[PDB]
Design a protein around this ligand. Sequence first.
Ligand code: HEM
Ligand SMILES: [Mn+2]
Length: 291
Amino acid sequence: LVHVASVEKGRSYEDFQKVYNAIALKLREDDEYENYIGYGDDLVRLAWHISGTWDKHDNTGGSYGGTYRFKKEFNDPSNAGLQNGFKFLEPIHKEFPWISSGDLFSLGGVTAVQEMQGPKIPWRCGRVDTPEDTTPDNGRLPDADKDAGYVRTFFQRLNMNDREVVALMGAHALGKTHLKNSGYEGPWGAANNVFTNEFYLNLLNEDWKLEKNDANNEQWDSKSGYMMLPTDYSLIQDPKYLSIVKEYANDQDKFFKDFSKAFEKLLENGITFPKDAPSPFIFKTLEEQGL
Ligand code: HEM
Ligand SMILES: [Mn+2]
């Protein structure tokens, strides 16, 4: 099963930067730190969840086909809340009907991360929408009520190693859990629509208590009002994860660089890029463009 990246006919950097900017401008328009719904946060979680269905074994799932547009995946319990990101992106897809769904969904997360001051994420176009029957079944996304071994094992299926896992998880610094979406409640940190290594710092420096939330699910709660999923807290239970947690907590740049590579890899798993495909695009943020 091979998915060859196919550049949207005639498109190039400028086109995607335009899509970037439309998303970025609407994020500025639609997001406020205080809001219940974090569109920017939904966009990077959506980019992850469209990719995280991937199975290296047979190349099913993955961001290529844009199958989140399909009911089965759209209604994945694991994707609860993401509909806001979809709805956010619809006017953008309408303005740019030529971009594929996969590219738009993935570009949304890239755009959201960059606009929330995260690292630059190189991004490659060429995802092609695939038919509804290529939609991956539900259940491929990870459970939050698990330990380090689960996590490590889970991400092996996504071809991610310990460093990649720990880096990727740092995106939880963005936003929070919403009890009605996931059975968890509370911010991981400064849920202020800012991408930072706060996730790691909180893990190491907060006073965590294993409690049960209003949904009868256990999560780690801090006096500061932060929370960690058991899977997040896994990263400091496991000694291998722990050393990388500490590295990222002590090196914002390193975290940014590693997150950047892992996110792009995540978003590109399952996709074959012909030797003559365009180079990855690095989009300018609104502020870099003075927009
Ligand atoms: C073992 C891994 C993972 C599990 C168990 C986990 C699970 C969850 C849970 C339960 C939520 C809350 C959804 C809702 O309540 O709104 C959350 C949200 C989120 N996830 Fe993860 N996640 C994992 C990995 C990732 C990765 C790899 C990234 C992306 C690089 C990521 C990005 C986020 C985003 C951005 C949020 C915040 C959403 C919000 O504020 O609306 N997650 N995660
Ligand atoms: Mn949100």
